[PDB]
Amino acid sequence: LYENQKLIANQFNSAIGKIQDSLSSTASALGKLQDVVNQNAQALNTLVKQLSSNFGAISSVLNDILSRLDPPEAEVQIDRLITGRLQSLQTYVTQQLIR
Amino acid sequence: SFIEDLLFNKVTLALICAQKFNGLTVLPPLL
Amino acid sequence: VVLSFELLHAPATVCGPKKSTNLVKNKCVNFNFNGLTGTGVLTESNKKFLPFQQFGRDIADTTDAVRDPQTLEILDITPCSFGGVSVITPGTNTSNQVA
Amino acid sequence: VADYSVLYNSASFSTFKCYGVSPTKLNDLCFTNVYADSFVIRGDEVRQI
Numbered sequence: 298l299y300e301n302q303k304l305i306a307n308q309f310n311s312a313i314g315k316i317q318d319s320l321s322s323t324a325s326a327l328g329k330l331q332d333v334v335n336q337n338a339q340a341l342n343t344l345v346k347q348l349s350s351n352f353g354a355i356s357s358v359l360n361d362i363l364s365r366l367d368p369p370e371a372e373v374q375i376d377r378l379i380t381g382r383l384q385s386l387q388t389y390v391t392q393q394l395i396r
Numbered sequence: 397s398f399i400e401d402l403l404f405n406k407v408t409l410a411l412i413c414a415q416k417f418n419g420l421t422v423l424p425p426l427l
Numbered sequence: 428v429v430l431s432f433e434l435l436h437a438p439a440t441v442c443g444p445k446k447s448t449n450l451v452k453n454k455c456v457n458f459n460f461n462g463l464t465g466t467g468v469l470t471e472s473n474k475k476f477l478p479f480q481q482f483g484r485d486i487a488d489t490t491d492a493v494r495d496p497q498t499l500e501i502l503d504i505t506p507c508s509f510g511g512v513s514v515i516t517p518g519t520n521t522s523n524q525v526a
Numbered sequence: 527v528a529d530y531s532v533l534y535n536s537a538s539f540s541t542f543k544c545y546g547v548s549p550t551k552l553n554d555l556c557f558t559n560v561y562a563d564s565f566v567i568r569g570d571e572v573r574q575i
């Protein structure tokens with residue numbers, strides 16, 4: 298080391314510079330963090346998008362079903378819709394715990 | 397640090413306020 | 428006689444003679460804008476809209492933008508401000524005051 | 527404007543099956559349009575439709 302101190306420092310700083318340029322050049326060099334953030338946000342996006350599905354019920358807007366049908370049949374209709382949303386949220390939670 | 401700012405502005409983070417309207421907010425990170 | 432009803436998102440033509448009332452702003456209300464039985468505060472913006480339609484959807488897949496059935500006017504529904512409560516509390520023996 | 531509250535009130539209706547929505551709730555929702563298909567059928571096949 299003491300035979301090559303200045304050379305070591307020079308190489309070190311040139312390496313710092315090449316790191317600067319390599320990072321600032323392309324986005325996909327930093328890939329793991331982008332992978333994790335995209336996976337989480339995309340899973341959450343699928344979760345929130347799932348609310349648009351009627352799951353076999355009359356519609357997806359719950360308030361529309363409340364306005365349309367009577368409680369003695371809104372019972373079964375909302376039962377189907379809630380069990381569907383519950384299943385979707387449950388699989389989301391399990392995959393969230395996996396990650 | 398200098399490299400840190402490159403890294404911050406190179407990661408794009410997320411509609412987002414529409415999620416808050418349906419319960420599933422994002423809790424703030426502690427640190 | 429069979430009365431076939433195609434309830435959907437469209438210009439409201441025929442419905443019951445329930446008494447209408449004027450609007451309010453910055454106060455969340457249990458509005459019913461021709462089946463749109465949601466809740467929230469009503470504001471305005473500068474956005475465009477179809478000449479005849481009454482519904483404005485979002486990525487969350489719910490009605491966000493509305494046109495009044497009486498006077499054609501652009502309205503923004505933002506559901507009444509809400510969040511969650513976090514009861515910060517020390518050990519029960521330590522104290523009974525909670526933040 | 528349709529007085530769907532009072533149309534239901536006529537006791538002549540012997541087979542009143544509202545598969546779409548509950549009868550008393552006909553009053554609130556606003557219909558995009560409406561089909562009114564009228565005819566007369568046999569007394570036996572009243573519930574085949």
Ligand SMILES: *[C@@H]1O[C@H](CO)[C@@H](O)[C@H](O)[C@H]1NC(C)=O
Binds near residue numbers: 520521
């Ligand atoms: C009473 O509260 C104090 C608060 O620190 C705690 O240390 C103590 O253990 C409590 N007493 C009992 C009997 O648990």
